[PDB]
Amino acid sequence: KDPSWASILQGLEEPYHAFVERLNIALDNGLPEGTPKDPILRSLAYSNANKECQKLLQARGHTNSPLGDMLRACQTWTP
């Protein structure tokens, strides 16, 4: 059963921060005790982002950057 949080995908018109927030909440609830959240969150923030935000993140070299940088990068994107 793939972790419920691994299936969280950014919607087509969902702002990136809203998506990251849902992801963050899911990880808080679903990660076993002692599992590092931050590296998982960063990885998923990129890999589960919609195509537009993924492009922005790639273009800026933020495919594994701190979450703050990823948030700033996708802010320019408004559905």
Residue numbers in the entry: 1 to 79
Which sentences did the original study use to describe this structure?
The retroviral structural protein Gag forms the immature protein shell of nascent virus particles. All retroviral Gag proteins contain three canonical domains: matrix (MA), capsid (CA), consisting of independently folded N-terminal (CA-NTD) and C-terminal (CA-CTD) domains, and nucleocapsid (NC). During immature virus particle formation, these domains function in membrane binding, viral lattice self-assembly and viral genomic RNA (vgRNA) packaging, respectively. Our results show that HTLV-1 uses a distinct CA-NTD arrangement to form the immature Gag lattice and that, in contrast to other retroviral structures, the CA-NTD is the key determinant of immature HTLV-1 assembly.
To gain insight into the immature architecture of HTLV-1, we used cryo-ET to visualize mammalian cell-derived Gag-based VLPs. However, to account for the observed heterogeneity of HTLV-1 Gag VLP shapes, we applied local C2 symmetry during subtomogram averaging. The resulting maps had a CA-CTD layer that was resolved to a lower resolution than the CA-NTD layer, which we predict is because of heterogeneity caused by flexibility of the CA-CTD. Therefore, we used both domains as independent species in a multiparticle refinement using the software M34. This approach yielded 5.9-Å and 6.2-Å resolution maps of the CA-NTD and CA-CTD layers, respectively. Within the CA-CTD layer, the only intermolecular contact is a dimerization interface formed by helix 8. The positioning of the individual HTLV-1 CA-CTD dimers places them out of reach of the adjacent dimers around the hexameric CA ring, not enabling them to contribute to intrahexamerization interfaces forming a lattice.
